[PDB]
Amino acid sequence: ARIAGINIPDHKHAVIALTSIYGVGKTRSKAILAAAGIAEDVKISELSEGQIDTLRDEVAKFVVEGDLRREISMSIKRLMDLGCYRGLRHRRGLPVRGQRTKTNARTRKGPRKPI
Amino acid sequence: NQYYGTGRRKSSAARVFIKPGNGKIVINQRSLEQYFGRETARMVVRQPLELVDMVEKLDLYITVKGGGISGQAGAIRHGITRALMEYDESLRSELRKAGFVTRDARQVERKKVGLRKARRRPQFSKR
Amino acid sequence: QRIRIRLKAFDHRLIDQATAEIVETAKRTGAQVRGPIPLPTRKERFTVLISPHVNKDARDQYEIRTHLRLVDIVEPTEKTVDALMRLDLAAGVDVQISL
Amino acid sequence: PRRRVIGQRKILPDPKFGSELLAKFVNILMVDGKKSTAESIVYSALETLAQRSGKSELEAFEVALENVRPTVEVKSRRVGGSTYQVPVEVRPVRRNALAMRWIVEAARKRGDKSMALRLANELSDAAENKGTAVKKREDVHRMAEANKAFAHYRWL
Amino acid sequence: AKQSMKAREVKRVALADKYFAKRAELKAIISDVNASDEDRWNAVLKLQTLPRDSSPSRQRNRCRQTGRPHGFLRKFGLSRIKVREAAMRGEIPGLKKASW
Amino acid sequence: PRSLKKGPFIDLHLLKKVEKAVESGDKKPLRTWSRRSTIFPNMIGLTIAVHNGRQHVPVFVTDEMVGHKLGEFAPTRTYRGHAA
RNA sequence: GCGGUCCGGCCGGGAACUCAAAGGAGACUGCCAGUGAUAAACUGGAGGAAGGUGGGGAUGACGUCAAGUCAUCAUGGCCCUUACGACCAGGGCUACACACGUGCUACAAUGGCGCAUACAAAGAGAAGCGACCUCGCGAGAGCAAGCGGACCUCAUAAAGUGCGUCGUAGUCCGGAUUGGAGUCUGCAACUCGACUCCAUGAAGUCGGAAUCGCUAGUAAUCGUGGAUCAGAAUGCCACGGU
Ligand SMILES: [Mg+2]
Ligand SMILES: [Mg+2]
Ligand SMILES: [Mg+2]
Ligand SMILES: [Mg+2]
Ligand SMILES: [Mg+2]
Ligand SMILES: [Mg+2]
Ligand SMILES: [Mg+2]
Incomplete structure (x- = not known):
């Protein structure tokens, strides 16, 4: 049941199960299914190891899971140690792309801390 | 040769023509079943064809422009009604009592300054 | 060479006076004409605080x-075009003669 | 309401069967200005009952209506400074109105495969009178029995 | 408004008039065209070199009769309230109070 | 961001002063008001006294900062906190 | 309707019609009946497209609040007049332990997702709207037709309907936030613009006391346009669909 990704995708449909994998959204899931050549409209037969083998050596060309996570941490921390304004917002837990901070910034800041 | 009718429900106009026939109706060079997707939208057109017995003897060319789905259907209904008015003018006591000759003058209201939806006033706090 | 007269004016009374004074000048030079048609009047609404x-x-x-009016002339003549130039009309209506 | 009294509003009758009640039922079922889908589900619900019960589904919906139509109400009032739930007899134009409204939300809490299916089961189970509609109507009856103590309070 | 503000605006529109037809449009097109190379870089330097008041975006249309920056109308070239009062006196042709 | 066809951005006075300083060697901080200019690799390893509104803050040019703008490393607001 | 029909109002052709706008007629408790105090009115009816002010708009009496505006403007008095005037570059009006008000998007199955398929009204447009064709997943780029407009362009509408999957799961929900890469305006998008593609997927499973709008095409909901505008709407002003 485990796909080449670290997580184990469910076995309910094909596109939906692919969209359960980290690093691939709906559009990237469509790309990988087009690369493999598998569609849901085929007959019920030959649903076996005959397709996930191709899945393993195709997904390797993408950046997913730890590699993508390692890249994202490096990007924010490259921003961090640089002493940048964009990193300074990252340090202070404030909106980083220029959203207002006077109100309506709750999701990046966290819950409303009282006085 | 062809009896004429006009219909307008909300913002649409209907062009309705009568000839003798075998009870077939064409709408905008298209069958009514193909054109009006909604079942209620479909059979409101043929509603006056029951109390009037001429359903099986009239081929009916119609062209309707403007408005929306329910509006065009109501316009279609009013146009057939008037087209019948210049034919028999003797079924009034039944047709008026149903309510088909009546032109629906009800209409969408203009937006107002200081209103959001032309009647809805913005929600305010007393304080 | 059938020409097409376009007339613009703010006031509806003025356009009717204009389209009714051009036509008998056309009869004065003596050429058959066609009836003016009402093109959709355009309404502009400014809402100011x-x-x-x-x-x-x-x-x-x-x-x-x-308000916008159209005139169509079927058989023009040099005398007819001279009459259009020479005739005087109200300052509220502009001329957009087209060959 | 305060100066000029007016009567009821006339609603175009049901086109497929000629009833006024079916049109009103589907209208009150209509939500967010969507009558197109409302017409589709009401026709589907009645035809499922047509194949289940007798062919004339008119009577089946009628009986599922009468066993839940309420003849007594509960009205909140304050005369001398105390909450009075006065019971009053309701005129039939409001009787049938309140009955079908409750059925509407009864179906929503059923939670079946689809909205059409749950309405069909709700209208069928009301015909046998085992329905949650009858449950609600027995619920209003017990509180109505309870309100007979309030029945002789102020503004009877 | 202020005589200083009005004097500022007249100078701004004059320089834009002076420069819009001589360099501005051609520098914009030669930066957009993909046929040229690195002559666009040279062009960007000279574009910045100009007095920089020549941009029509540097202009703010104001009520010419009063200089009010806000509530301007392009068709009448006046402030909102200045249009209203002049309309009441009847100075704008074909203008009245709407109703529909 | 300025479109790739248009290239990056740089100011004439800044560009002329950067190349003179580079040619004459990194000697002194470069005084500037043009925060809108973009950090270009020609000024690597230099200290730029970028203006924030009241005081020209020095910044050192490093490889990882290239592409970001000159005025980016000059926070114009001083907010310690809403506490004492 | 006539014929022709590059079989598409496209061509002669017709002005009957939809429509465009110009004038005119009609809706007045006009007639009947009942109530009423034989009055006025109210109720019902007949006809009638519309019946009781037909539905909305403009129109706001005398006066109240030392209501708001000296920052549209003008103006009495007061003050500066090598400065409370004036020219510049950068910055700020966008800051954030918090509170309030007004809104937009949701929590979903009446929904989400994909395909096929049908109709609107109102407006804008000459330093402007910009087709078709080609490239680009894309916002856009290139070439460039036409349109001062009932012709040309923004321009096709969206919920709708028919199909199949989703199957009640913080989910093929929800979209914040964040990363990377980009497009367009403009001298320049760091503070501080909008939009596109890929990557992440936070709260939220309908909300306490309390509180607001709305009586008919009105609530509700779905899109569309305008002014402001180089660029910058969930605001404002308008339009139509159910
Ligand atoms: Mg509306
Ligand atoms: Mg002054
Ligand atoms: Mg500006
Ligand atoms: Mg005061
Ligand atoms: Mg004050
Ligand atoms: Mg502000
Ligand atoms: Mg704009």
């Missing part, structure tokens, strides 16, 4: 209506 400092519900709506 009336208070000097502060309000929002107090606002007045001002509309400019421009």
Whole structure:
């Protein structure tokens, strides 16, 4: 049941199960299914190891899971140690792309801390 | 040769023509079943064809422009009604009592300054 | 060479006076004509805040209506075109003769 | 309401069967200005009952209506400073109105495969009178029995 | 408004008039065209070199009769309230109070 | 961001002063008001006294900062906190 | 309707019609009946497209609040007039332990997702709207037709309907936030613009006391346009669909 990704995708449909994998959204899931050549409209037969083998050596060309996570941490921390304004917002837990901070910034800041 | 009718429900106009026939109706060079997707939208057109017995003897060319789905259907209904008015003018006591000759003058209201939806006033706090 | 006269004016009374004074000049030079047609009058609505400092519900709506008329001349003549140039008309209507 | 009294509003009758009640039922079922889908589900619900019960589904919906139509109400009032739930007899134009409204939300809490299916089961189970509609109507009856103590309070 | 503000605006529109037809449009097109190379870089330097008041975006249309920056209308070239009062006196043709 | 066809951005006075300083060697901080200019690799290893509104803050040019703008490393606001 | 029909109002052709706008007629408790105090009115009816002010708009009496505006403007008095005037570059009006008000998007199955398929009204447009064709997943780029407009362009509408999957799961929900890469305006998008593609997927499973709008095409909901505008709407002003 485990796909080449670290997580184990469910076995309910094909596109939906692919969209359960980290690093691939709906559009990237469509790309990988087009690369493999598998569609849901085929007959019920030959649903076996005959397709996930191709899945393993195709997904390797993408950046997913730890590699993508390692890249994202490096990007924010490259921003961090640089002493940048964009990193300074990252340090202070404030909106980083220029959203207002006077109100309506709750999701990046966290819950409303009282006085 | 062809009896004429006009219909307008909300913002649409209907062009309705009568000839003798075998009870077939064409709408905008298209069958009514193909054109009006909604079942209620479909059979409101043929509603006056029951109390009037001429359903099986009239081929009916119609062209309707403007408005929306329910509006065009109501316009279609009013146009057939008037087209019948210049034919028999003797079924009034039944047709008026149903309510088909009546032109629906009800209409969408203009937006107002200081209103959001032309009647809805913005929600305010007393304080 | 059939020409097409376009007339614009703010006031509806003025366009009718204009389209009724051009036609008999056409008869004065003696050429058959065609009836003017009402092209859809255009209405422009400006909504302006009336208070000097502060309000929002107090606002007045001002509309400019421009009426547009078309004339078609079937068989022109040099005398007919001379009459169009020579004839005097109201300052509220502009001329857009087209060959 | 305060100066000029007016009567009821006339609603175009049901086109497929000629009833006024079916049109009103589907209208009150209509939500967010969507009558197109409302017409589709009401026709589907009645035809499922047509194949289940007798062919004339008119009577089946009628009986599922009568066993839940309420003849007594509960009205909150304050005369001398105390909450009075006065019971009053309701005129039939409001009787049938309140009955079908409750059925509407009864179906929503059923939670079946689809909205059409749950309405069909709700209208069928009301015909056998085992329905949650009858449950609600027995619920209003017990509180109505309870309100007979309030029945002789102020503004009877 | 202020005589200083009005004097500022007249100078701004004059320089834009002076420069819009001589360099501005051609520098914009030669930066957009993909046929040229690195002549666009040279062009960007000279574009910045100009007095920089020549941009029509540097202009703010104001009520010419009063200089009010806000509540301007393009068709009449006046402030909102100045249009209203002049309309009441009847100075704008074909203009009245709408109703529909 | 300025479109790739248009290239990056740089100011004439800044560009002329950067190349003179580079040619004459990194000697002194470069005084500037043009925060809108973009950090270009020609000024690597230099200290730029970028203006924030009241005081020209020095910044050192490093490889990882290239592409970001000159005025980016000059926070114009001083907010310690809403506490004491 | 006539014929022709590059079989598409496209061509002669017709002005009957939809429509465009110009004038005119009609809706007045006009007639009947009942109630009423034989009055006025109210109720019902007949006809009638519309019946009781037909539905909305403009129109706001005398006066109240030392209501707001000296920052549209004008103006009495007061003050500066090598400065409370004026020219510049950068910055700020966008800051954030928090509170309030007004809104937009949701928590979903009446929904989400994909395909096929049908109709609107109102407006804008000459330093402007910009087709078709080609490239680009894309916002856009290139070439460039036409349109001062009932012709040309923004321009096709969206919920709708028919199909199949989703199957009640913080989910093929929800979209914040964040990363990377980009497009367009403009001299320049760091503070501080909008939009596109890929990557992440936070709260939220309908909300306490309390509180607001709305009586008919009105609530509700779905899109569309305008002014402001180089660029910058969930605001404002308008339009139509159910
Ligand atoms: Mg609306
Ligand atoms: Mg002054
Ligand atoms: Mg500007
Ligand atoms: Mg005061
Ligand atoms: Mg004050
Ligand atoms: Mg502000
Ligand atoms: Mg704009």
